Amino acid sequence: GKVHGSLARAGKVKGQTPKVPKQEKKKEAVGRAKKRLLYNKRFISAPVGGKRAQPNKQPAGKLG
């Protein structure tokens, strides 16, 4: 911190971020079809001991 916050720094990070575009967009399920997807992914695809693995389990990264 040679210089701290000021009015000249508004938008610094949002202007710095390298702007990775978004991917190809295969369309999302809505309504009954999404309820079906969730019911299947949760309650029948079930390893019955750990109970109900959490959905957003991410691979092993720098922190482990």
Binding site: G31, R32, A33, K35, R36, L38, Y39, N40, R42, F43, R52
Partner: protein
Amino acid sequence: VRKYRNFSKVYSTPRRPFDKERLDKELKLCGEYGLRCKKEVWRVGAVLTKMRSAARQLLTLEEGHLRRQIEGAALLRRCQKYGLLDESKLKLDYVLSLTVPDFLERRLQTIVFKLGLAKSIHHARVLIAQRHIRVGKQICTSPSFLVRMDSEKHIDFAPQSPLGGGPPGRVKRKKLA
């Protein structure tokens, strides 16, 4: 201004919107009975809540009180003609054992799926929404139609639909022509 027609809400949003128990149970029954959102569950739950609260306030009375006679006879006749309660369990304590599945299987979707008209419950909902199915003679097209015990034996395909005795739909009409 002077439009005196009524409207109302059929369901109530639960407190504690992020409880694991209620979320997983609601999703379980939604996937089991082919439901598009949680409000389809909460309206059945509100109907059940009204029925059970009426049953409770009636059971708080004796037998022979005018309220008991009229409203309890009405509740039992309702829960009978809609296949919630059978001839055996036709009492105000058995109407308190009502569960949301007790209405979700009365739901027209589940009935045309159990009658083998459709392969899966989602296929059933698709049929009803695409108006292939009559209840009695009327083409019903709302999958939440609460099929009474009487009109349960008159469910059938519609004569206007290709499934049954109707003309070919778009794709078969084109494939032939």
